[PDB]
Amino acid sequence: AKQHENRLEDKDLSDLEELEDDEDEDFLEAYKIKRLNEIRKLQERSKFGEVFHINKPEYNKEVTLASQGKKDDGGVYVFVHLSLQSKLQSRILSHLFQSAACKFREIKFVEIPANRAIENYPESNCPTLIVYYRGEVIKNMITLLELGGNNSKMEDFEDFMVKVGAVAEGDNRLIMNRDDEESREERKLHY
Amino acid sequence: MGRPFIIVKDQGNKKRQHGLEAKKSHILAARSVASIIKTSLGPRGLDKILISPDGEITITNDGATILSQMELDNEIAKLLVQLSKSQDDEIGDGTTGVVVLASALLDQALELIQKGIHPIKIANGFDEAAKLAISKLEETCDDISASNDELFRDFLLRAAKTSLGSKIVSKDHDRFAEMAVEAVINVMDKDRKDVDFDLIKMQGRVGGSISDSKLINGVILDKDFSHPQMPKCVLPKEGSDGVKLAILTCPFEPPKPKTKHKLDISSVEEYQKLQTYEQDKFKEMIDDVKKAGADVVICQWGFDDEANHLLLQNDLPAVRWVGGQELEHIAISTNGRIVPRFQDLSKDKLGTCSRIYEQEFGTTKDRMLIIEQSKETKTVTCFVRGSNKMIVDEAERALHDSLCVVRNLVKDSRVVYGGGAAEVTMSLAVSEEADKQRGIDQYAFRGFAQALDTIPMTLAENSGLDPIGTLSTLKSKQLKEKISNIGVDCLGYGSNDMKELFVVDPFIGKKQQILLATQLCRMILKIDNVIISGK
Amino acid sequence: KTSRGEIIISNDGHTILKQMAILHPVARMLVEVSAAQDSEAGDGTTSVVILTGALLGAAERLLNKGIHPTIIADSFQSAAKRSVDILLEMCHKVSL
Amino acid sequence: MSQLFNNSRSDTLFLGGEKISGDDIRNQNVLATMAVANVVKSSLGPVGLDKMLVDDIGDFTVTNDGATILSLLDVQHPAGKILVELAQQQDREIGDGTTSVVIIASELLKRANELVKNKIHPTTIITGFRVALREAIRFINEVLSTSVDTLGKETLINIAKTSMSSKIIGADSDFFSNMVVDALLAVKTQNSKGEIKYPVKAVNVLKAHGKSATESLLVPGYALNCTVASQAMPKRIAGGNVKIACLDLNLQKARMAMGVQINIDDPEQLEQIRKREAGIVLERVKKIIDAGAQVVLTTKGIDDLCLKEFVEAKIMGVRRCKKEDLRRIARATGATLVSSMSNLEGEETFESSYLGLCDEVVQAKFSDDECILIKGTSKHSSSSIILRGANDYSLDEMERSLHDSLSVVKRTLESGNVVPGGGCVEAALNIYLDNFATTVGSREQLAIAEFAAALLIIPKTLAVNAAKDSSELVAKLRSYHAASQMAKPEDVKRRSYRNYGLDLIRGKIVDEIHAGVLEPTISKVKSLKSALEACVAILRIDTMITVDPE
Amino acid sequence: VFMNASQERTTGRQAQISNITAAKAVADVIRTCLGPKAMLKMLLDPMGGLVLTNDGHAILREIDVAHPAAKSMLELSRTQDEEVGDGTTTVIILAGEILAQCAPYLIEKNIHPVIIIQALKKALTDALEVIKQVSKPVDVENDAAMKKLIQASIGTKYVIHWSEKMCELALDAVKTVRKDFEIDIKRYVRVEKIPGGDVLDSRVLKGVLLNKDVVHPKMSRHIENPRVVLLDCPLEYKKGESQTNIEIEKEEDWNRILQIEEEQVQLMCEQILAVRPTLVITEKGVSDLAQHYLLKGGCSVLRRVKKSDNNRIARVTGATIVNRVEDLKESDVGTNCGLFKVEMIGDEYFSFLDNCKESGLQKACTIMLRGGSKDILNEIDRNLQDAMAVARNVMLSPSLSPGGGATEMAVSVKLAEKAKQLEGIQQWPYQAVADAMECIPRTLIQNAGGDPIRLLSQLRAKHAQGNFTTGIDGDKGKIVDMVSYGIWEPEVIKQQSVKTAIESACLLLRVDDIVSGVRK
Numbered sequence A: 001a002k003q004h005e006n007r008l009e010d011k012d013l014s015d016l017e018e019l020e021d022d023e024d025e026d027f028l029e030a031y032k033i034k035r036l037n038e039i040r041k042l043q044e045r046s047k048f049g050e051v052f053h054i055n056k057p058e059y060n061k062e063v064t065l066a067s068q069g070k071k072d073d074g075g076v077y078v079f080v081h082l083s084l085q086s087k088l089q090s091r092i093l094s095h096l097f098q099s100a101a102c103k104f105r106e107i108k109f110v111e112i113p114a115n116r117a118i119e120n121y122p123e124s125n126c127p128t129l130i131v132y133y134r135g136e137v138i139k140n141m142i143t144l145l146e147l148g149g150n151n152s153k154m155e156d157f158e159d160f161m162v163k164v165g166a167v168a169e170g171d172n173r174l175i176m177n178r179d180d181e182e183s184r185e186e187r188k189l190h191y
Numbered sequence B: 001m002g003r004p005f006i007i008v009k010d011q012g013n014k015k016r017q018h019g020l021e022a023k024k025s026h027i028l029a030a031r032s033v034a035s036i037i038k039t040s041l042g043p044r045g046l047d048k049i050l051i052s053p054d055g056e057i058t059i060t061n062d063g064a065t066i067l068s069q070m071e072l073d074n075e076i077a078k079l080l081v082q083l084s085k086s087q088d089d090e091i092g093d094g095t096t097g098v099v100v101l102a103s104a105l106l107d108q109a110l111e112l113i114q115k116g117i118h119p120i121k122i123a124n125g126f127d128e129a130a131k132l133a134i135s136k137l138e139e140t141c142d143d144i145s146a147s148n149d150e151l152f153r154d155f156l157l158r159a160a161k162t163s164l165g166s167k168i169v170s171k172d173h174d175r176f177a178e179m180a181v182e183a184v185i186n187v188m189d190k191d192r193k194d195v196d197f198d199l200i201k202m203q204g205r206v207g208g209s210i211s212d213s214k215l216i217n218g219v220i221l222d223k224d225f226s227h228p229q230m231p232k233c234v235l236p237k238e239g240s241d242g243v244k245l246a247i248l249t250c251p252f253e254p255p256k257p258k259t260k261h262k263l264d265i266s267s268v269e270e271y272q273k274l275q276t277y278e279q280d281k282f283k284e285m286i287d288d289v290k291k292a293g294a295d296v297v298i299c300q301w302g303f304d305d306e307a308n309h310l311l312l313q314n315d316l317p318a319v320r321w322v323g324g325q326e327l328e329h330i331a332i333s334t335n336g337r338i339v340p341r342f343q344d345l346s347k348d349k350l351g352t353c354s355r356i357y358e359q360e361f362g363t364t365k366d367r368m369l370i371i372e373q374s375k376e377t378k379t380v381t382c383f384v385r386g387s388n389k390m391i392v393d394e395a396e397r398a399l400h401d402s403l404c405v406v407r408n409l410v411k412d413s414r415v416v417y418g419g420g421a422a423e424v425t426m427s428l429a430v431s432e433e434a435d436k437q438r439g440i441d442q443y444a445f446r447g448f449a450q451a452l453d454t455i456p457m458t459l460a461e462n463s464g465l466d467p468i469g470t471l472s473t474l475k476s477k478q479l480k481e482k483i484s485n486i487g488v489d490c491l492g493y494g495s496n497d498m499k500e501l502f503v504v505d506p507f508i509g510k511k512q513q514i515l516l517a518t519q520l521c522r523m524i525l526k527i528d529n530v531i532i533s534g535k
Numbered sequence C: 001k002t003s004r005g006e007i008i009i010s011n012d013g014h015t016i017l018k019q020m021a022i023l024h025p026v027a028r029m030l031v032e033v034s035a036a037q038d039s040e041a042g043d044g045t046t047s048v049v050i051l052t053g054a055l056l057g058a059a060e061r062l063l064n065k066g067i068h069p070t071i072i073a074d075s076f077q078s079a080a081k082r083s084v085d086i087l088l089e090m091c092h093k094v095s096l
Numbered sequence D: 001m002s003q004l005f006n007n008s009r010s011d012t013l014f015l016g017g018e019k020i021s022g023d024d025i026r027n028q029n030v031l032a033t034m035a036v037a038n039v040v041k042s043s044l045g046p047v048g049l050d051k052m053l054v055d056d057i058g059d060f061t062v063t064n065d066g067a068t069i070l071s072l073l074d075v076q077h078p079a080g081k082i083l084v085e086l087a088q089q090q091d092r093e094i095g096d097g098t099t100s101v102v103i104i105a106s107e108l109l110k111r112a113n114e115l116v117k118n119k120i121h122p123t124t125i126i127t128g129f130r131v132a133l134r135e136a137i138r139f140i141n142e143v144l145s146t147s148v149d150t151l152g153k154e155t156l157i158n159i160a161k162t163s164m165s166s167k168i169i170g171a172d173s174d175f176f177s178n179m180v181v182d183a184l185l186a187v188k189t190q191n192s193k194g195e196i197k198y199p200v201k202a203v204n205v206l207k208a209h210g211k212s213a214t215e216s217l218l219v220p221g222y223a224l225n226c227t228v229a230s231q232a233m234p235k236r237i238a239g240g241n242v243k244i245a246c247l248d249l250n251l252q253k254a255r256m257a258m259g260v261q262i263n264i265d266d267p268e269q270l271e272q273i274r275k276r277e278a279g280i281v282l283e284r285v286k287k288i289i290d291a292g293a294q295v296v297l298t299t300k301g302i303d304d305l306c307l308k309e310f311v312e313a314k315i316m317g318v319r320r321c322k323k324e325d326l327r328r329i330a331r332a333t334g335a336t337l338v339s340s341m342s343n344l345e346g347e348e349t350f351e352s353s354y355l356g357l358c359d360e361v362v363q364a365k366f367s368d369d370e371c372i373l374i375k376g377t378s379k380h381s382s383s384s385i386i387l388r389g390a391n392d393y394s395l396d397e398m399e400r401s402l403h404d405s406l407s408v409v410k411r412t413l414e415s416g417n418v419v420p421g422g423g424c425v426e427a428a429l430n431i432y433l434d435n436f437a438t439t440v441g442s443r444e445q446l447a448i449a450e451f452a453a454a455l456l457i458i459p460k461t462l463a464v465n466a467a468k469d470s471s472e473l474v475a476k477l478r479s480y481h482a483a484s485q486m487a488k489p490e491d492v493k494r495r496s497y498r499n500y501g502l503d504l505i506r507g508k509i510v511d512e513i514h515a516g517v518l519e520p521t522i523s524k525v526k527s528l529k530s531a532l533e534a535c536v537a538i539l540r541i542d543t544m545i546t547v548d549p550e
Numbered sequence E: 001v002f003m004n005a006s007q008e009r010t011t012g013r014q015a016q017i018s019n020i021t022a023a024k025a026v027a028d029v030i031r032t033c034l035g036p037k038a039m040l041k042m043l044l045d046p047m048g049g050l051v052l053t054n055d056g057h058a059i060l061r062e063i064d065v066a067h068p069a070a071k072s073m074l075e076l077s078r079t080q081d082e083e084v085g086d087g088t089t090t091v092i093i094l095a096g097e098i099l100a101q102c103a104p105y106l107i108e109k110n111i112h113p114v115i116i117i118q119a120l121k122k123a124l125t126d127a128l129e130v131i132k133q134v135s136k137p138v139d140v141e142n143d144a145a146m147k148k149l150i151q152a153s154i155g156t157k158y159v160i161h162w163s164e165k166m167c168e169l170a171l172d173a174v175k176t177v178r179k180d181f182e183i184d185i186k187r188y189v190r191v192e193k194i195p196g197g198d199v200l201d202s203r204v205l206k207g208v209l210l211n212k213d214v215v216h217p218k219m220s221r222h223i224e225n226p227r228v229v230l231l232d233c234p235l236e237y238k239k240g241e242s243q244t245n246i247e248i249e250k251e252e253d254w255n256r257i258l259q260i261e262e263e264q265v266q267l268m269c270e271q272i273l274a275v276r277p278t279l280v281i282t283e284k285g286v287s288d289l290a291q292h293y294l295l296k297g298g299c300s301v302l303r304r305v306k307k308s309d310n311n312r313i314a315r316v317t318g319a320t321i322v323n324r325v326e327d328l329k330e331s332d333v334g335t336n337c338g339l340f341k342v343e344m345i346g347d348e349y350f351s352f353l354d355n356c357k358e359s360g361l362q363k364a365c366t367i368m369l370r371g372g373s374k375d376i377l378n379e380i381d382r383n384l385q386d387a388m389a390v391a392r393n394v395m396l397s398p399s400l401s402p403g404g405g406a407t408e409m410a411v412s413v414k415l416a417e418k419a420k421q422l423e424g425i426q427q428w429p430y431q432a433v434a435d436a437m438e439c440i441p442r443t444l445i446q447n448a449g450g451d452p453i454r455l456l457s458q459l460r461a462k463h464a465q466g467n468f469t470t471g472i473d474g475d476k477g478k479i480v481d482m483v484s485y486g487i488w489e490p491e492v493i494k495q496q497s498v499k500t501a502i503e504s505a506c507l508l509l510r511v512d513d514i515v516s517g518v519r520k
C-alpha cells in the first residue's frame, strides 16, 4: 500500500520530475500542482528571517500579537531568548537563532537581554527560551542541559522545533531529513 | 413508533421538573443559602472560611465574598451569587441582608402558594407594597445637607463606625473610622461634590500589627532603588521645597527605532566614531536632566548599568521598573504631567513632594517607598497592616466596604437609621394599608410585612434577646409614637433610642435591599420548567 | 407497584403509606399513625396525616421564633383537649 | 410523547423507584394503551388482518382473538395489565367483542385525557359516562327485535356468520354454520327445573391436518382422542346396543397401601401371596367381562394382566385420558362414572344399570391418529367437530375461532332478543346521546358529547381496514341514523334506517336483514360496563409510585 | 420502556413482501428436485448423520429456518406425507407459485387479502370438478396395470432400473397388509435393513425377521412345523409388587426359600409344556434355570423381544398376546408356521419365520432390503413408502388422474377460459390461479433442458384440440400423450396438492405484521 504513496509523498517538486518519463502525466502533474500550491503558501508566510532584537514596551506586541498572527487560525510561533552575555550557553543559543532564522522564515526568532526582560531575574536560570503561540506559552524551557548543555549542536535545536509543533517531521529543510547529495549518489549506484 | 424516542441530544443527563413540588425545592434551597449567612448578620456576626481549589485560604463575613468563588450546582443559588454581587458592585453594602430579605419574601410566598394563589399575582402584591414601603420611608426621612461642614464632618463618623462595627476591624472603631473619612476629605470639591473613586487607591502590607496602621498622602511602591548605596531619606534644600519629581515613560537606554534595522558599520573610522556617539549621548543625557533640575527620576523600565552609576555621581537617585498602571497615579498626587520624550523636559512639568524615605520591614529583603505630602493633594492611598495575610485582606475589604458606604453619603446626603427601625417602620405601613385594601392581595401585603420582620428578628436571634419581647415592643411602641429611629439594640445597651448610639445608614443602600430582592423573587417565582444538563 | 409482582390500586391513605417504602424514619411514623387511625376509628386516615403536616409547618416557623419545642408541644395538647371540649358541645345526638 | 425524564428529588426520599406526578402519568398511561390498541386495531372485522407472534423456540401463534394476542403479550406496565386481564375476563364470560371492548376503552382514555386537559374534573367526567351508559342500556332495550316469521334455523345460521367472519374460515361459513348450530342442539340438557343450559367446551376439537376445511365431517355423536391399548383388539364392534362401561378404577398389578409391611415366618406363603395380590384385581375384571361390556372406558390406567384378560373376549381397551371427557360419555350413553366399585351390602358386585348404550362404535383413522368415534347415543345426544386444515397452526386458529362461534350461538339461545351489528348500535348511540343532555346544559354536555364520539371509532376502524374512503361511509351512517331518530313515529321507510348501516365487502349501504349481519343483545350488554370500569381504573390515577424488587 | 416488543415492527406492505419472498425461497431450494431427471440432495444434520434424498418432505425435515412465515410452508410436507405418502415436493412447489402470482395484485392493484380468498374457493370448487372429469376409472384387480401404476412414482427415484422387481415387491406387500372397506396401514410394514448384498436376490418373504438367536446351543435350528406361543412376563422369579420380608427363624427356611425359587419356575414351565410348544417367544428377559426344562419338552427360548414385533408375530402365527401363564390353552397357540431357519451374517444373527400361506385377521410381512451401504438402504426404504403409498389410493378410490402435469394443466385451461365469463372484481385473482398451475409443467420442462416457451405454447394449442391426456415427456422433452406413454398416477394426490396449496395461501395472506421476541 505504501509503495504507491511513496511515489508522491516522498518526493518534492524537484524530485517529482524524476517520474515524468515513467509515471503518467495526469497522475504526476495533479500532485505537482498540489505541492506547488503548498510552496506558495510558505512564501507568503515568510514574514521573518533574522533575529528581532527587541525591547520591552514592544514585547507586549511583538511577542504576543504575533503569536496571534491573522487573528483562518493563522498562528505563528515566536521563540524568545532572554540573553545574558556573561553566560556561555547564551552566546551559543544566539548563534542557533540566526542559523535557524535563515532557514525557517515563517517562524519568528526573538531575542532580548534577560536583565531587561523580568525585574530582578535570576542570572543562574539564564539563558531562557520561551515559545509563544496564539498568545499562549507552549514551552517554558530551562537552561540547555536538556539539549546537551555546552555541547549543544544545530541538530539538537532543530529536533526541539519538531517537538513543539513548529516544523513538520518530514520537512526537507531539517538536517535529519536533508540527506547530502553524496549520500543519495551512493544509494543510486548500489541500488 | 420505535423504542428510541429522541428529540434533543443527551436526554439522559437533561431532566425536567414541574408542578408545585418543583417550586418547593427552589424556596427551600434558598433557606439553606440564607441559613448559612443568617448568623453573620449584625454586629454579633461570625465569619466564614473559604478554600479555593489552588489551596489559597481566606476568611470573611461579606455575603458577596462568601458566595463568590464557590462551587455551586443549583441555578437558583447562582442567582443569589449574582444578587449579592450586584449590591456589592453598585453599593458595596447589604449583601447579606438582600439575600436574607429575598429568602424571607420566598418563605412567606410559599405559604401563600400552598393556600392557593398564582405566583405572578403574588409578586404584584409585593410591588405595590414595596413602592408604598419606600414611599413611606422617604416621607419620614431626615436630610443632613442644611448643616455646615463641621457638623457634616461628624455624620461621616456615625455611618463609618456602623459598617466597620460589623467587622473584625472594630477593636478601635474611633481610630480606623478617621482613616475612611480623612481619605474622602482630600477628594471632595465642597460644592456639587463627586467622589472620584478611581483616585483613591488601597494597598496593604502583611507585617506588624493592625494598630500601627496610619493614613498617608501619596503613593505606596513595592520596589527598591536602582542602586543600594543611594540615600534612603531624601529631604529638600534651601529653596523649592518640592523635590521636582520627573516621571518618564522611556528608560535610560540607547535610542533605536521599533522596526527591524541593521546599522552598516564600515572600516575602523566608523567603529571609533560610534564609540564617541554613545559616550556623548550619556553626556548629553546627564546635562539634560541637570538642566531640568530634577532630584528623583523614575522610569517604567530599567536603566542601563553604566546609566545606574552616572546618576549616582551627581546625587540623583532613581527608582526603576515602576509599573505602567502605577506610573500614572504618581503624577496626579504630585500635580505634574508625564513628558513623552526627553527633549520636551522643562521646569513646569516636574513634580513636587514633601519628603520620601525607604522603609524597612524586619529581616525581609524588600524595600518600600512612602511618599508624603504636607498639604492637601488630589489622591490618597491607604496603608493597612496586620499580623496575617488574610487579616490584611479582611481589613482591606472592611475598609473598602466602609469606603463605599461613605461614598453614598457624598452623592446622596439623605440618610436613614437602620438596625430594625426601618424594617418595622416599613412593615406596619403596608399592614395598616392591607385591611383598607383587602381585595385579594392582602395576603401578599401581610407576607411582605412578615418578610421585613425577619431582619430585626435575625438581629434579635444573634444578639440573644427574646424575639417575642423585641418584636412586640417595636410594633407596640412604633404604633404609639411617631418617632421612627428605634430599633434592635444588639450590643446590650440600656436604651434602644439610636440618636445616642451613633448609628447611621444610607437611603440608597437600604432601598436596594428591597428593590433587588423583590425584583429577583419575581423571576424565581416565574420558573416552572427546570432543566439541568449534567456535566 | 410493590417489590413483588403484585399491583394494587389504593385511595386509602393508610394503604398508600403502608405500601410506600420510605427511607426517612420520621416520615415512616405517619404509617403507624394511619394504622392507629385505621384501628381505632377506621375513618379519616389521610386527615390525620395532612393535619400532622400542617402542624409541623406551623411548628417550622415557631422554631425560628425562639420558643422551646416542649412549650410548643404541650400547647397543642392543651389546644387539642379544648378542641374535644368544643366537639362535645356541638355534638348532635342521634337515636338508634 | 414524554421526554426529559423526571429529576431525582432530594427532598422526597422513598425507597425503590422514583416518584413521578402531573399530567405525564395520564400521558404515559394513554401511551401504554396505544401500544396495545394499535396491535388489535388492524385485526377487527372481516376486512381486518392479524399478525404472528413467535415463542422464541421456533413455535409461533397466528391469533385473531384479543384475549389470546394480549395473553402472550406480557405487559410490564401496570395500566396495560388492566386491559390484558379484561380480555381474559371478556372471553371467559361472553366470548365475543374482545377486540371492541379494548378499542372502546382505548378511545375513552384518549378523549378522557383530552377532557382532563380541558380543566374538568374526572369525577364529573365519570358521572357523565354513567348517566350516559344508563340511558344507553335503556336505548338498547328499545331497539331489540324478537325472532318471528323465520323459516327453520335461519336466525341461528346467519347470526353465526357474523361471529364466523373475521377469521380464515369465514369463506366456508356456509358449511360450518349448519354443523355449529346442529352441534349445540345435540348437547341440550335440563337444569334448575326447566332452565335451558349447555355445558362449557362440550364439543370436542381434534387436530387432523389433511384434506380441507370444506369436507369437515359432522359425526353425530361423541369423539375421543385415545390410542388402542392392544393392537390385536378389534377396531369395529358390529351389532346395535353396544354397552359402554365408564370407570375411574385402576386396574394394574396393584400394590397394597402405604402402612402395610408384610412379615411372614413360613416360606410357602409367598406362592399364595404373590398370586392373591395379582388375583385380587382379577375379581374386579372377571365381573365386568361377564356383564358383557363390549367397550370399557377408564381414566386411570390398565396393565398387562388385565389388558390380556380383556382381549380374551374381544373387548376394546382405553389408556390414559382426561377426567372431564368421560363424564359426558356417561351422560350421553347413560352410564354412571364410578370412582370406586363397591356396594352398600357387605359384598362387592357389579350391576347392569351402570352400563351405557350406543348404536355403533368404531376407531376411525384421521391420517395418522387413533380416535374412537361413538355415534348413536341412547340417553342424550352428543356431537363432535372434526377440524381439518393445511397445517397445525391453522388448526389452532380453528380451535379458538370455533370456541368463539360456539360461545356466540350459546348466548343467542339463552335470550331470544337480538340486536343488529355492523356499527349500527354505535352509530345510533352516538346520535342518541348527542341529543341527550341538551336540557341538562351547563357542564355534562361536553363530557357526554365526547363520549358519543368515542363509540364512533368502531365504524372508523372497520373502514380503514378495508382501505376505502372512510368519511364517505361515516357521512352515510350518521346522517341516515339521525334522519331515522328524528322522524315521526309514523314513517315506515325512515324507521327502517334505524336498522341498517356499514357494509365492508361491497362498500355500499344495504339491509342487514337481507345481508344476515346480526349479533346477540348480550354481547353489547356488560361490554360497555367493562370498558367503563376499565376507563375508571386508569382515569382516576394521578401519581405513579414504583418500588424496585428486592 | 414498555413490553417486550417494538424492536422493529415490520408493518404495512413490506411485511407481506417478505413473506412472498420467503415463501418463494422455500420452493427455490427444491426446484430441481422434481421430474424424472431430478437431482439428489445431501443435507448435514448437526448430530452427525446424513440424509441423502430428493423427496421434498425428507429435505424439509432436516432444514431449519428462523422465520415464522416459512415454517407454515415447512409443515405442508407433513400434511402430504401423513395423508397419502406421495407428492410432497409437488405440494411445496405449487404453493410457492400461488403465493407469488397473487402478489403482483397485493402489491399493486390493491386488492385486499380477503377478496383473493373468496376468489380461490370458487377456483378450488372448480378445480375439483375438472379434476373429477379429467380422471378416468381403472380396474383394481388388473395386476398388469397395477404394476405400471405403482412404478409411476418409482420412475422419479434411483430404483427405476429395478422397477421390474420393486413393483412385484410392493404389490405383494400391499396385498398382504390389505384387509378384505379395503383399509390398510403401514405400522406392520417392517422396515428392517440388511447392509450389503445385491438388489436382485432381495425379495419379500411372508413372516417376520428377528435380530437375535436362540439362547441354548441344543435348540433345534430347523423345525418343520413350528408352534409359536407368545409370553409377556419374564421367566425369572417375580419378586412381586410388595416386599416379601421373610422373618427367618429356623435353619431349614433359607434353603426352602431358595428351593421354592426353583419350584415356581418349574410350575410355570410345566404348564407351558401342557400344549408342548416348539418356540416360546418371551417379551421380557429369560432365566438360565428355566430354559433347560423347556428344552426337555422341546421348546425354543429367545432373548427379550420388544412387543412391536410380537404384535406382528401375533398376526402372522395367529397367536394372542398372553401374560398370565396359568390360563394357557391349546386354542391360543400359534400354528400353520412354514419353516424355521437361522442364517449366518457377520453383523448379527437372523432368525427366519416362514408361513404356510394357507377370512380373518390381516397378515403381516417383512420386506428384505439388500442395498450397497447404509444410506442406500434408507434411500430405498423411503422409495417403498412412496411406492406403497400409491397402492392405497387406487383401492380407496378407483379413479385415476393423468400424470405428467396433464391434470394441473387441465385446471389451468378451464380456469383461464372461465375467467373471461367471470366479469367483476374477482376476475384478477381467479385468472392468476391458472398462471401457477402451468408452472408444474414448467418445472418439469426446465429440468429436461427443454424450452418452456414454445413447448407450453404448443401444449395449449394441442390441449384444446387434441385431447385432455396430453403431457410432456420428461426424458425426451417432447409432447407425448399419457395414453401411449403408459404412466398414470392416482387422483387422490392431485386433490391434496390443490387443496393443501390453496388452503396454505389463505392462511399466509391474512398476515399483517410480524413481531418477534415476546416471551417463551
Ligand SMILES: Nc1ncnc2c1ncn2[C@@H]1O[C@H](COP(=O)(O)OP(=O)(O)O)[C@@H](O)[C@H]1O
Residues within 6 Å of the ligand: B040, B041, B042, B043, B061, B062, B063, B093, B094, B095, B096, B097, B162, B163, B165, B166, B418, B419, B420, B488, B489, B490, B491, B501, B503, B505
Ligand atoms: N452598633 C450597632 N447598633 C445597632 N445596630 C447595628 C450596629 N451595628 C450594625 N447594626 C445593624 O446591623 C446591620 C448589619 O449590616 P452589615 O452586616 O454590616 O452589612 P452586611 O449584612 O451587608 O454585611 C446594619 O444594617 C445595622 O443597621
Ligand SMILES: Nc1ncnc2c1ncn2[C@@H]1O[C@H](COP(=O)(O)OP(=O)(O)O)[C@@H](O)[C@H]1O
Residues within 6 Å of the ligand: C011, C012, C013, C042, C043, C044, C045, C046, C047
Ligand atoms: N359528599 C361530600 N361533599 C362534600 N364534602 C365531603 C363529601 N363527602 C366527604 N366529604 C369531606 O371529605 C372528607 C373525606 O375524607 P375521607 O377521604 O373519607 O378520609 P379517609 O378516606 O381517610 O377515611 C371528609 O372529611 C368530609 O369532610
Ligand SMILES: Nc1ncnc2c1ncn2[C@@H]1O[C@H](COP(=O)(O)OP(=O)(O)O)[C@@H](O)[C@H]1O
Residues within 6 Å of the ligand: D043, D044, D045, D046, D064, D065, D066, D095, D096, D097, D098, D099, D100, D161, D162, D163, D164, D165, D166, D421, D422, D423, D502, D503, D504, D517
Ligand atoms: N359480515 C359482517 N358484516 C358487517 N360487520 C361485521 C361482519 N362480521 C363482523 N362484523 C363486525 O365486526 C366486529 C368485530 O367482529 P369479530 O372480529 O368477529 O369480533 P371480535 O371483536 O370479538 O374479534 C363486530 O362488532 C361486527 O359488527
Ligand SMILES: Nc1ncnc2c1ncn2[C@@H]1O[C@H](COP(=O)(O)OP(=O)(O)O)[C@@H](O)[C@H]1O
Residues within 6 Å of the ligand: E034, E035, E036, E055, E056, E086, E087, E088, E089, E090, E152, E153, E154, E155, E156, E403, E404, E405, E406, E444, E472, E473, E474, E475, E487
Ligand atoms: N416420467 C415423468 N414424466 C413427466 N412428468 C413426471 C414423470 N414422473 C412424474 N412426473 C411428474 O412429477 C410430479 C411428482 O411426481 P413424483 O416425483 O412421483 O412425486 P414427488 O414430487 O413426491 O417426488 C407429478 O405431478 C408428475 O406430473
Ligand SMILES: [Mg+2]
Residues within 6 Å of the ligand: B093, B094, B163, B166, B401
Ligand atoms: Mg455591612
Ligand SMILES: [Mg+2]
Residues within 6 Å of the ligand: D096, D097, D098, D163, D166, D404
Ligand atoms: Mg368475534
Ligand SMILES: [Mg+2]
Residues within 6 Å of the ligand: E086, E087, E153, E156, E386
Ligand atoms: Mg412421487
